[PDB]
Amino acid sequence: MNRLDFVDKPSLRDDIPAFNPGDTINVHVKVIEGAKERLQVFKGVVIRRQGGGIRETFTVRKESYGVGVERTFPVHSPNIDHIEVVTRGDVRRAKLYYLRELRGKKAKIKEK
């Protein structure tokens, strides 16, 4: 509980799935290209949750063309359409920063 929870409570998004660091996630991002409003999917491994309620972020990481990319989104952000949980990973950390220096087979997470 916090002092500013009554401010944040009409702004939290329900129906966000439970996901841990290590999971593989689809992120459906609203994109504005002129006057089109399409929807682009970012598929990757969750490497971070930094808590806080309305100010909670998460970071997802993929490998596009030999180049690792990380996106950091606010949880409860309205430019996320929805989040789909592909794969449950099995890790021992919480921040998973060691995946930033691994490539290929060695950057692969288990299946629990």
Partner 1 sequence: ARKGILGTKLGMTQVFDESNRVVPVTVVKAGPNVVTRIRTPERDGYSAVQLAYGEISPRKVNKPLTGQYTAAGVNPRRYLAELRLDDSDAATEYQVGQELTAEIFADGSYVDVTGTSKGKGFAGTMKRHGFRGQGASHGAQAVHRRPGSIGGCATPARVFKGTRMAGRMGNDRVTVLNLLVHKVDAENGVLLIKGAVPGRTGGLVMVRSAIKR
Partner 2 sequence: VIQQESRLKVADNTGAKEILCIRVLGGSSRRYAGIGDVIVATVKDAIPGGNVKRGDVVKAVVVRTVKERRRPDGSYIKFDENAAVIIKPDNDPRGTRIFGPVGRELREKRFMKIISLAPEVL
Site residues (vs RNA, CB under 7 A): 1-3, 18, 20, 49-53, 55-57, 72, 92-95, 97-98
Closest listed residue to residue 16, CA positions, set 83, 108, 109? 83
The residue range among 7-15, 20-28, 38-46, 89-97 that interacts with partner 1, by the rule CB under 8 A, is 7-15
Q: Which does 67 bind (CB under 5 to 8 A by kind): Mg ion, partner 1, partner 2, none?
A: partner 2
CA atoms within 13 A on the CB side of 70: 11
CB contact set of 96 (below 8 Å; sequence gap of 6+): 21, 22, 45, 46, 47, 48
51 binds Mg ion (CB under 5 A): yes
51 binds partner 1 (CB under 8 A): no
